[PDB]
Structure 1
Amino acid sequence: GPVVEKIAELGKYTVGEGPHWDHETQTLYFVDTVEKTFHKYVPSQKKYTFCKVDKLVSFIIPLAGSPGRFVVSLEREIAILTWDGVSAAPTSIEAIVNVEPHIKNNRLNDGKADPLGNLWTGTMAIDAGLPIGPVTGSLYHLGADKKVKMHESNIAIANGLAWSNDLKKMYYIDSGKRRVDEYDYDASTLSISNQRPLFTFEKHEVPGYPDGQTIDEEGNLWVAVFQGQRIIKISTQQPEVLLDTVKIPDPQVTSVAFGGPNLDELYVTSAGLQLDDSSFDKSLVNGHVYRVTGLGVKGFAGVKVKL
């Protein structure tokens, strides 16, 4: 079976999240969604750095055409951070847009660029809760003239995103729905329609909640299972098909990104935050970062945000 390696050099994260693999520099970026920190890991040189801000963060993606600059979330603001990748604070911050200026207790959560470079991201209540809590989030993309467009409402916990290689489908996760949805994606109008369930956890006895996801070159989705101690591989060719399961030692698996020189090493983030209604004792909940090899598939380089 696949080899799952704990990355000792990286330590433990409260809620490690938002992994992004920059292929040209062979570098993994990620966030902690509770500790207000950004992180960088260069595996070939065993280099780790972090960056501190005073707002909640949920994604970090290099800005297309601008080395040393990243598109990030700061609470409800999408911003450009100028960061040298090693100093413990940004050099400067340029706000782009506040997606929800008048929703004081919301935050941005998972975000990713579509294959054309458009940032998609969604919101949630800061005090969201599972299985039931306040449902206040929406799904957005950042379009022309730095204005966002809304694509879906009634989202409890805005989470993982992916797009099919032919640009005809988008895949999206609200963790509260315990399923992955598929949509028809119109790449020319950047709109989505015909929402329908692709994969429903209760139909397959999958525990926990879908969190982040990514897609491989064959079109399979790799989905992080928070409170499931696993990643799952699911079909996009047929609905409701579980292709494989890979156990990850940490129960609170949060997200996934393919990396390595050949894009065939799956990086997996997790959360050490100990929650009061957990299905796992505290001794099991650590928050390590993992690397999975031997899956027999390749992914895609992380896409930069175009502004």
Structure 2
Amino acid sequence: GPVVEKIAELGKYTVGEGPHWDHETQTLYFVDTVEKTFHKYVPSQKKYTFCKVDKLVSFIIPLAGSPGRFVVSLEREIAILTWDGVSAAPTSIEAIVNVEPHIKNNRLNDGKADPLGNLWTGTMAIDAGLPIGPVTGSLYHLGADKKVKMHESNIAIANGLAWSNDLKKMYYIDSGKRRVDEYDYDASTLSISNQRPLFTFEKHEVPGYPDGQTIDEEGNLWVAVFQGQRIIKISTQQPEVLLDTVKIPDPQVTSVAFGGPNLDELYVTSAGLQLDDSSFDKSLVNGHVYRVTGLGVKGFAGVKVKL
């Protein structure tokens, strides 16, 4: 079976999230969605740093063509942070756009660049709840002239994103739906259509909620299962096919990104936040970062955002 290693050097996170592997610098970036912090891990040098802001954060993605700059979320704003990767605060902040200026209790959540470099990200109520809570989120992409376009409404908890290698499909998770959806993706118009369920947790006795996800070069999706103590591997060739399960010690698995020199080491974030309606006692809920090897697949380098 695959080897699941707890990364001792990284400690515990309230809600570690948003992992991004920069392949040229062999560096993992990630966030804590509650603690208002960004994080960097350089595994080959065992180097860890953090960066503090005063707004809720949910993703960190290098800006294409601009070393030392990152596209991030700050509450409902998409912004460029100039950060040296080591100081405990950014050097400067350049706001790009507020996606929801008049929705005072919403926030951005998961986000990722499509393979063409367009940032896609969605929102949620800050006080969203599972299985049932306020449903106030939408899915966006950031297009030309720094304006966002909306693609879907009625999202409870805007979560993991991936695209097929042929650029014909997008995959998307609202954790409240307890399923992964697939869509036809038109790369020329940057629009999605024909939404349909790909994989439905209840049909496979999978507990918990889908959270972040990523795709491998064979086209399999790797999905974090929050309150399921696992990642799952699912088909994109046939609907409703569970290919494998890998248990992760932390129950609240949050997200996934392939890394390492050969793109074959799966980094897995988790959450130590202890929630009142948990299926797991507090002693189990820690928030470590893990690395999974031996999966027999390779992923893709993290894509930078183009502005």
| TM score, norm. by length of structure 1 | 1.00
Instruction: Give deviations 1:78-120, integer Å, cap 9, x for gaps.
Output: 0000000000000000000000000000000000000000000
Instruction: Give deviations 1:31-73, integer Å, cap 9, x for gaps.
Output: 0000000000000000000000000000000000000000000
1:125-140 paired onto structure 2 within 5 Å? 125-140=125-140
Q: Separation in 2 of the partners of 1:269 and 1:101? A: 30
Matched with 1:194 is 194
- Local SS of the residue matching 1:279: coil
Mind listing any 5+ residue stretches in structure 2 that lack a counterpart? none
Per-residue deviation, 1:194: 0.1
Matched with 2:213 is 213
Per-residue deviation, 1:24: 0.1
Per-residue deviation, 1:233: 0.0
Instruction: Give deviations 1:111-144, integer Å, cap 9, x for gaps.
Output: 0000000000000000000000000000000000
Q: Separation in 2 of the partners of 1:134 and 1:85? A: 36
Per-residue deviation, 1:13: 0.0
Question: Which 4+ stretches in 1 moved above 2 angstroms?
Answer: none
| 1:149 is aligned to 2:149 | yes
Per-residue deviation, 1:150: 0.0
Matched with 2:76 is 76
- Local SS of the residue matching 2:283: helix
Per-residue deviation, 1:257: 0.0
Per-residue deviation, 1:304: 0.0
- Local SS of the residue matching 1:176: helix
Aligned residues: 307
Q: Separation in 2 of the partners of 1:245 and 1:167? A: 26
Per-residue deviation, 1:171: 0.0
Per-residue deviation, 1:187: 0.1
Per-residue deviation, 1:2: 0.1
- Local SS of the residue matching 2:24: coil
| 1:253 is aligned to 2:226 | no
Per-residue deviation, 1:159: 0.1
Per-residue deviation, 1:238: 0.1
Q: Separation in 2 of the partners of 1:241 and 1:143? A: 34
Matched with 2:284 is 284
- Local SS of the residue matching 1:180: strand
Instruction: Give deviations 1:260-289, integer Å, cap 9, x for gaps.
Output: 000000000000000000000000000000
Per-residue deviation, 1:231: 0.0
Instruction: Give deviations 1:144-189, integer Å, cap 9, x for gaps.
Output: 0000000000000000000000000000000000000000000000
Per-residue deviation, 1:22: 0.0
Q: Separation in 1 of the partners of 2:248 and 2:224? A: 10
Q: Separation in 2 of the partners of 1:132 and 1:298? A: 36
| TM score, norm. by length of structure 2 | 1.00
Q: Separation in 2 of the partners of 1:49 and 1:132? A: 36
- Local SS of the residue matching 2:185: strand
Q: Separation in 1 of the partners of 2:279 and 2:155? A: 24
Per-residue deviation, 1:18: 0.0
Instruction: Give deviations 1:194-249, integer Å, cap 9, x for gaps.
Output: 00000000000000000000000000000000000000000000000000000000
Q: Separation in 2 of the partners of 1:275 and 1:208? A: 13
Q: Separation in 2 of the partners of 1:117 and 1:201? A: 30
- Local SS of the residue matching 2:54: coil
- Local SS of the residue matching 1:196: strand
Q: Separation in 2 of the partners of 1:177 and 1:244? A: 21
Q: Separation in 2 of the partners of 1:15 and 1:260? A: 23
Per-residue deviation, 1:259: 0.0
Q: Separation in 2 of the partners of 1:199 and 1:225? A: 13
Same amino acid, percent of matched pairs: 100
Q: Separation in 2 of the partners of 1:104 and 1:150? A: 18
1:94-109 paired onto structure 2 within 5 Å? 94-109=94-109
Q: Separation in 1 of the partners of 2:50 and 2:127? A: 26
What root-mean-square deviation, in Å, do the aligned CA atoms of Structure 1 and Structure 2 show?
0.1
Per-residue deviation, 1:256: 0.0
